[PDB]
Amino acid sequence: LNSSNYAELFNNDIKLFVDDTNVYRVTVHKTFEGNVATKAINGCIFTLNPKTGHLFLKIIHTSVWAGQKRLSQLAKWKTAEEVSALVRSLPKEEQPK
Amino acid sequence: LGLLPKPEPKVKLSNMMSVFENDQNITDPTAWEKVVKDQVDLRKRKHLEENE
Amino acid sequence: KALPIPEDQPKKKRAGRKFRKYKEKFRLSHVRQLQNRMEFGKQEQTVLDSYGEEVGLGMSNTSLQQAVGAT
Amino acid sequence: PSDSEIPPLLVYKWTQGINNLSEIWDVSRGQSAVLLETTLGEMAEKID
Amino acid sequence: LSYLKDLENDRVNSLSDATLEDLQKMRTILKSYRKADPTNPQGWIASARLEEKARKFSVAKKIIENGCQECPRSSDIWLENIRLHESDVHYCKTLVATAINFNPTSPLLWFKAIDLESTTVNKYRVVRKALQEIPRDEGLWKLAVSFEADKAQVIKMLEKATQFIPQSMDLLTAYTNLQSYHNAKMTLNSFRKILPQEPEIWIISTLLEERNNPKLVSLLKEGLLELSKNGYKATLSAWLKRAEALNDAPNSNLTCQAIVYAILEWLRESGEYESELNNVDQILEKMPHSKVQIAVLKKLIQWDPCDTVLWSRLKMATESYEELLAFFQELLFQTSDDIRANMREKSPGLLMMYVSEYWKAQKGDTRQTLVLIDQIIDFAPHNLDLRFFK
Amino acid sequence: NEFLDSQRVWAEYATKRQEAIQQNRRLAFEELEGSWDRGIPRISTLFQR
């Protein structure tokens, strides 16, 4: 998907955008001044149906990461799993291309 | 052999997303929408006006 | 009736939902493009069709997909 | 051609049958085996 | 204009064997998935699946079991492991043992074990073990009930099931069937009445009641009682829907009729819906030539005059290929005092229909004549239609 | 070799089937690995979708 083929996104085919940028949210809390504050918050998986504007937002709980390593890698896998689950949930009529 | 008028691109709400000859098409989304919807209305209105 | 003077003109340049479709029928598809790519090293995936086994899918089928099954 | 045999297999089967007929190979009493093979020429071509 | 091969006519199945190189990529991916913390379970499962498909049936066995052993303790993985070993007995048994020690709470493993074990005694033992571990699993209880040939033990099992699963209906029904007395039925009712049971449980009681088979008029009363006692959820013709299958069994149809009548009465008390009636009619039409539906129609007729219903009744009778006639006779006899008036008012073909039915029934041509005469007498201004048949 | 092997592996398959029946199972196509791409028709036939 490109600047070129953006118009392709709004044909009559069903699609899901999947943002896993915000899955492991770590926070270092900062206001407009810039004070430090260390923490490791809950995360999310943004999944969007730009036809309907449904937003299947899986809220990743922080309990996930307790005693976990290769954390980043794990996150990706988790996201994938979530996506799969979502797909399964969707009926064939509503499922995405 | 004239250029007495000009021919523009006939947008609609299915084109909308795909026309770029006229500007603002993602830039100003709702403005663009207004333009395109407005255009459509005019077309329809023109037809109706003609009928009248 | 004669052949036309072979001149090589590129006048067309068209496109348009309307005109795309038509041409989409003649364009190679994206899966055909994929097929036309064959992975380099590997013994690349063939469908043995009874009339002729010859046929290579090619890189249409994804590596993982290929390893498992069809698409 | 049946749906059972690939032709190689058919051939094999035939051979087996020819061997496995009762006392074909014994010709001590002058027994004569005769394995007539033939095309039916024009058969397809000359159906009424 | 050689056109392009219609994309979706590309070649599909019975492909060449998957390449080692290709497989290795997949393996690597799966390793990454696994090693990047366990899922916990599904990663292993996924790997197993891949192996099965890849294909391979040795590496999977080696690795999947190992995976199962250390970190995870999910039923699903155990199940997968079991599946992987179709090698009939010993390995499977071992797997089961490993599982139930770890996960006794998950029914699936128990079921698998049961499936595995061929001998009936063994199966019974397994079931018992499951029960000891897990109390609530209705299916297991049912299986247990099924297993045995003797009586007392079976009864005991049923009792246990009742104790454990509070609102298993099938089990309750089975128990009821077992004991075989009116006292027993009463006891059962008592046991149940204490329990909260709003929706549709007294149907069982009704069924039990008409095991005697002569009694039947008290059924209606019981039905009436049922809804008033219970703090109920407003429903119409759900009972009928549920009655259907039940009705279809032997010695149940009669019971169903009473229930239907009760329901109708309740509806009347509540108020005339219009849609509900239509729904009921539709239901009746579906699954035709059945007795409960007929009963409903009969009840309706008794309540109020309906020519459509009468036609429907006739149709039902035809489908059946006599009940209607009987009903008519009953109507004439029990209350020709009140019926003559209504009939007279109608001035209808009901009489004609009756006559026709009689004719169909009898070649002896005397009973029919008598009936006709009665009808003539019955009708006070005497109906015109009757005479022609005579 | 193919015809003799076909004869062999179909007998084997039959035996397996019988065993399955005795132990009440649908025949596991996991077991028939080894004698899979052998036989005419192949044992790959029997479990094609």
The vertex-E128 CA angle with E126 and E130, nearest 5°, equals 70
How far is Cα A84 from Cα E239, in angstroms, rounded to an integer? 41
Residues with Cβ within 8 Å of E291's Cβ and at least 6 positions away in sequence, in order, are: E247, E253, E256, E257, E323
Question: What resolution (Å)?
Answer: 3.7
**Tokens read off for E285:** 């039409």
Residue the block writes with tokens 């899901």: A16
Minimum-distance CB partner of E22 among C29, C46, C63: C63
| Torsion of Cα atoms, F42 then F47 then F48 then F49, to 10° | 170
Neighbours of E348 (CB within 10 A): 16
Minimum distance, in Å, between the CA of residue A8 and any CA atom of chain B: 9
* Listed residue (E292, E291, E310, E293) closest to E301, CA to CA: E310
* Listed residue (E306, E230, E288) closest to E262, CA to CA: E230
The answer, for C30 touching chain B at a CB cutoff of 8 Å, is no
Residues 37-56 of E with CB under 8 A from A: 37, 39, 42-43
Long-range contacts of the stretch D25-30 (C-beta < 8 A, 24+)? none
Q: Which positions in chain F touch E88 (Cβ < 8 Å)?
A: 23, 25
What distances in angstroms separate CA A74 from CA A49, E31, E35, E311, one per listed residue? 25, 12, 9, 71
Pick from F30, F32, F35, F42 the residue to mutate for testing the E interface (most E CBs within 10 Å).
F30
> Do residues A97 and A13 make contact, with C-beta atoms less than 8 angstroms apart?
yes
Q: Which residue does chain C place closest to B14, by CA atoms?
A: C17
**Tokens read off for C41:** 């090293």
Neighbours of C22 (CB within 10 A): 11
What distances in angstroms separate CA E302 from CA E71, E106, E264, one per listed residue? 71, 55, 12
| Torsion of Cα atoms, D21 then D22 then D24 then D29, to 10° | -160
Q: Identify whether E40 is preceded by a cis peptide bond (ω within 30 of 0).
A: yes
Size of interface D-F (CB pairs under 8 A): 5
Neighbours of E339 (CB within 10 A): 16
* Listed residue (E317, E297, E295, E315) closest to E306, CA to CA: E297
What distances in angstroms separate CA E300 from CA D35, E2, E224, E239, E261, one per listed residue? 86, 72, 17, 17, 9
Q: Which positions in chain F touch D9 (Cβ < 8 Å)?
A: 3, 6, 40
* Listed residue (A36, A38, A21) closest to A72, CA to CA: A21
> Do residues E227 and E211 make contact, with C-beta atoms less than 8 angstroms apart?
no
- D6 contacts F40? CB cut-off 8 A: yes
Tell me how the structure was determined: cryo-EM
Neighbours of E212 (CB within 10 A): 10
Residue the block writes with tokens 């939902």: C17
The 8-class DSSP code of residue E389 comes to H
Residues with Cβ within 8 Å of E305's Cβ and at least 6 positions away in sequence, in order, are: E342, E346
**Tokens read off for A53:** 């504007």
* Listed residue (E159, E226, E224) closest to E197, CA to CA: E226
What is the DSSP secondary-structure string of E128-176? HHHHHH-S--HHHHHHHHHH--SSHHHHHHHHHHHHHSTT-HHHHHHHH
Minimum-distance CB partner of C27 among E4, E16, E21: E4
> Do residues E229 and E189 make contact, with C-beta atoms less than 8 angstroms apart?
no
Backbone phi, then psi, for E199, in 5-degree steps?
A: -65, -60
Q: Which positions in chain E touch F48 (Cβ < 8 Å)?
A: 14
**For chain E, percent helix, then strand, then coil, each to nearest 5?**
70, 0, 30
How far is Cα B34 from Cα B12, in angstroms, rounded to an integer? 11
- E12 contacts C25? CB cut-off 8 A: no
How far is Cα E308 from Cα E314, in angstroms, rounded to an integer? 10
* Sheet with A17-19: strands ordered across: A17-19, A43-49, A54-60
Minimum-distance CB partner of F31 among E13, E52, E86: E86
Minimum distance, in Å, between the CA of residue E50 and any CA atom of chain F: 14
Long-range contacts of the stretch C36-41 (C-beta < 8 A, 24+)? C39/C63, C41/E21
> Do residues E11 and C57 make contact, with C-beta atoms less than 8 angstroms apart?
yes
**Residue environment code for E103-129, b if the CB has 16+ CB neighbours within 10 A, otherwise e:** beebbebbbbbbebbeeeeebbebbee
